[PDB]
Subunit: 378 residues, 4 copies
């Protein structure tokens, strides 16, 4: 009764490979040119990586070297896994300055595109993130954690996890269903896999107080999982946008993050929307907070700002919407200054979630105390 | 009071070109082989279309002809438009991906995943107003482009509508954005007036248009370079304009290029089918259905019914009626909606949800649901 | 004094890989549709095979399956060699009927393109082929022979050989220089390689009566040769046309063979030119014979026929040119009937030479006795 | 009596587009880095250009801009022509391939291979007549295309000339083939007359044109679809039209896309340099030079001089003079011909041999060779 489900994928999933390659290229460019315009779309298939899009930068980068290193760190170094970073093909289809100061104050620059973006936060977890997506992320990051340190050496990078939570009036009741399918080598059978996944992955993550005898567990439910990654499966950037955000707990505007420089409101505004939502919840102004911002191309001011507090607000929501508008610069290049986004920090974001990890700029809660006593509280 | 905003793109938008090419390949395979497994990802860039993925089927089909015909119908037929269906490159990287149930209806889900369905009586088609009219703006744009009413504009186009709600009720439209590609023969002033008279005003109801409504028509000026040139399009990059424009939640699954055995597409269609029939039955004003699946499991791992307080009958009675009247098993909803037919290129532009001629948009269960509930 | 040199490459050379893939696709199509028009150009790079061109056929073929099988038979099945047929990328860019009975007698059809083609034959060897290219071919085919039967298991497919012959008035004097560079594994050093190449490759091919103490031998002259094949080296069809023919001993028209159906005069006319030249020499009418034919598009009769007998003719060369014109149908679709070319026999030709192997139709000498007593001899 | 035939293609022929793109990339790298190692293979097809190979250089260069500029200068700038430099796809698959001699001139050959050079006093440029005038026909075609004399014809074009010889002496021209791409505005009759008056007659000497000369002008009719569309072009697929049109033998090495350290290109240029100076010195009427190289060896493994009986001095004296006056070592002929300069896009169409403004076409050794021989 009253259940919610969220899924996640590891860094070896072909979609996440394309996300990591895109942001890897972005980080390389930003390391030389912080003001660069980057729109990098990566296509990864069996034996192939296609890196395309449009960049406008003074930087000079090696797309092949960046791509091979990124796949090499993911762990695809051998043809027995279905993909090898040293022998795969790397093709490039990157165009330059698309024929487009304009503004006396750079912060007043209009948006580069239209679109809608969402941010979310909930005091369910320590990191102000929804439980299902948080623990789904932690399962697949542990699977890579135990593959990379040699604990379970038979694991291969491609993996997917899914956690179904039972809810009762916003109260986290427990876990009703766990799904975890991981790619593996020939050095293990399915019965030893289902037991090793329980002991080395699921147990050090899902709190024992949420697992009962009724919790359905599906570990490699179809059996053998040896062929994976780009082998026999396509990977495109921007095909895991719900995994990259809130696992379905919150709504989405449709924009991908990876391969996009901070001037692309699809990424920066979504990070800022998370920044507002986390600070509103961290300030104690709501238990759950979702905000939507939208933009029109060539318009600096957001065309709409909605603050949704699902009955959890500790102050009228009209007051919340005004607090958002004055304590945060939601203008495109205002986001960049507010979050200090012109740095090569994005290859790390393309993997196990863009949110919930406290060292990102959009995850710091330096505005919570300000919002708290600005709304007159304690 | 609050504002909500949704967007849509024309059939000429690069991401939507990829979606249509992926479903055009799908339709041509289903026409010969209705039980085909197809997972077709399309990548469109300046001068080329890359059609890839995994396909296992007994159908023989010409990817080049399908791709060229699709782009041709979309409208890119000249180098002056930035893309030409008769001279672009078409590369294929399609592979063949490498009998368990006595009843095919009991087959387990091909993959895990969560899907959402939504419905709301804001509009006649039981869809959210922002996404609905965002679709009708870009669809009207293509309409007046193809019938020669405005011959000077080009396929690539984007729309965005900002609605104002007073706690569930539509009060009007706050902001309208329409950006359309065009040729050199037209100036921006005559362009703005033409899309205001032929595109915007015939689509948005005059009751929602006030003097405070903002109209952004080609806000940055000339829009000559468009489509696959200057940008880049990939299948499944418009999943929110495909569904409910952000009004409802989304599981993360793309639609185009996937046969009905993929729960990412099929279960979302079914989730819309149940949500729409619930709202059409008067059981709720707004309704969101969440379905979750586990790979190898036929029964959904979760079925959530959220009615946002608009529940006209008890919520437990709603979740029960969903299980009674709807078969949400992977191959059960294929038979419930008759999905093994080439009918998917139509869905790849202007929204998968909202057009009553689709199987998941039929309300043939509405009177049944209303009877089993009371009145 | 008076030296001549010719080179050859093995079936693992990236250029020969593209030739084999092209003809493999051609054979597959001809096996279903003998009348098919095929123009298949293959591009093979690290981790990638691109198969393009124009085909017009009722056949339905699997380009990916044909490509992987062809590379699999060549021996690239592992990423340690630099290329794997199971995990590489296969892309296709094949167009259909390019918008082009026409003739009451099909044999009178005009040529599909212009161009020039050469054929050659010399009684130096048993197979009426020049010695240098023949023995250069035999060296690299032996290298694959000893790699495939497990004799020298450390060999990798990519290999190149080159033989310099000393001549004295057409008399084969001996061998002055041998070059043989073969790709190898880590299971051998360079000194053991240079000795094993001598014992297992060079010795059972080059006759001992042609090797002196002055014969320069260059076996892996640069040393270690571990990275090869498509890895770090491009391969295109039609980039080994001199290896495919007479090793430079004879002239060439410029046309590639592989991937072209027999209606393409670049291939069929060259095979027929070899057919004429071999029969002229086999009939005893000349010791060395080179013929050139040329075509104009839409013209059935060759625009020119030259019979060059380098002072070796046993009958006036004017008479030879007339004998050629009446004992051979050099019209495009006359070649096809004369040589019975509408069969899938071409994947075998894309490797160690299109000539010199007696089981090919253009290599049979069923017209020699006819030419001999037609010119009035014995 | 005998007939000999050679062919040539225009700068718009698909194989030649690939050769020019490969050398345009080469020229732009040499302009910044003269000692760069580049091996650039280009693949042109309907709507796309794939530029691949192995390159190690300190130069930063824009493959897209170089490719688009090259095709643009070639003439494909509209979809009606079948290819457009401003909207085609440009993919790059270039890698970096993964200090031994005290004197750089003593470096060993980067690869094995045999190369041929040729020269004959049949023409003023000391080239075989069939290939020479085959080049001048397609070059005249582009000439009258670009200066607006005939604006209706398009870049793709092929020529072929059949010469008749009476044992070494030119007697005339037997057959002329000229096929040129064109637009729809022109009919085949007016096309045949126009290329006869503006292309063929201004190029082929009237002494060689009789009433028995065959003229095949667009022999199959309309030639509208051309260039990369309908066909397919690869670097190094025109090695015989690049050199001597079949009159001389060929080693098998392609030219375009290769820096001067590649003996396939460099030694062939040098072999032409020696053959031309020998013929220009009056030492022979026809001369063919064969040079062979072993990888890692600086001295050529073979140097053959064939004069076809036209030797005006003893043949042993000729082979000696070649070794005395020419440095045929891999990096020796780079310095002998000053090859480390961006001068190679010019060679990628209309013949590498024949145009006196190239380094390997200079006859600065002719008087020297004649002195050291006698007179
Ligand atoms: Mg995917
Ligand atoms: Mg997009
Ligand atoms: Mg090569
Ligand atoms: Mg060609």
């Amino acid at each position: 009764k009253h259940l919610f489900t969220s899924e996640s994928v590891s860094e070896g999933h072909p979609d996440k490979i394309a996300d990591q390659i895109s942001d890897a290229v972005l980080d390389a460019i930003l390391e030389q040119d912080p003001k660069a315009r980057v729109a990098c779309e990566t296509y990864v298939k069996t034996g192939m990586v296609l890196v395309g899009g449009e960049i406008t930068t003074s930087a000079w980068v090696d797309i092949e070297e960046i791509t091979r290193n990124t796949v090499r760190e993911i762990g695809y170094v051998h043809s027995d896994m279905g993909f090898d970073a040293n022998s795969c093909a790397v093709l490039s289809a990157i165009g330059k300055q698309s024929p487009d100061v304009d503004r006396a104050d750079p912060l007043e620059q209009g948006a580069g595109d239209q679109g809608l973006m969402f941010g979310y936060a909930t005091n369910e977890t320590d990191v102000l993130m929804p439980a299902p997506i948080t623990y789904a992320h932690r399962l697949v990051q542990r699977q890579a954690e135990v593959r990379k340190n040699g604990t379970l050496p038979w694991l291969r990078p491609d993996a997917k996890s899914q956690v179904t939570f039972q809810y009762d009036d916003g109260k986290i009741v427990g876990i009703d269903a766990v799904v975890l399918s991981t790619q593996h080598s020939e050095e293990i059978d399915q019965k030893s896999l289902q037991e090793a996944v329980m002991e080395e992955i699921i147990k050090p993550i899902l709190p024992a107080e949420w697992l009962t005898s009724a919790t359905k567990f599906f570990i490699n439910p179809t059996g053998r999982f040896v062929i994976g990654g780009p082998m026999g499966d396509c990977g495109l950037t921007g095909r895991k946008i719900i995994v990259d955000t809130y696992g379905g707990m919150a709504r989405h505007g449709g924009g991908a993050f990876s391969g996009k420089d901070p001037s692309k409101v699809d990424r920066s505004a979504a990070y800022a929307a998370r920044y507002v939502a986390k600070n509103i919840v961290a300030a104690g102004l709501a238990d759950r907070c979702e905000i939507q911002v939208s933009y029109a191309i060539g318009v600096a001011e957001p065309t709409s700002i909605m603050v949704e507090t699902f009955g959890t607000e500790k102050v009228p929501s009209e007051q919340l919407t005004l607090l958002v508008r004055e304590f945060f610069d939601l203008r495109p290049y205002g986001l960049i200054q507010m979050l200090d986004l012109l740095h090569p920090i994005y290859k790390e974001t393309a993997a196990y979630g863009h949110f919930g990890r406290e060292h990102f700029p959009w995850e710091k809660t330096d505005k919570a105390q300000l919002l708290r006593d600005a709304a007159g509280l304690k």
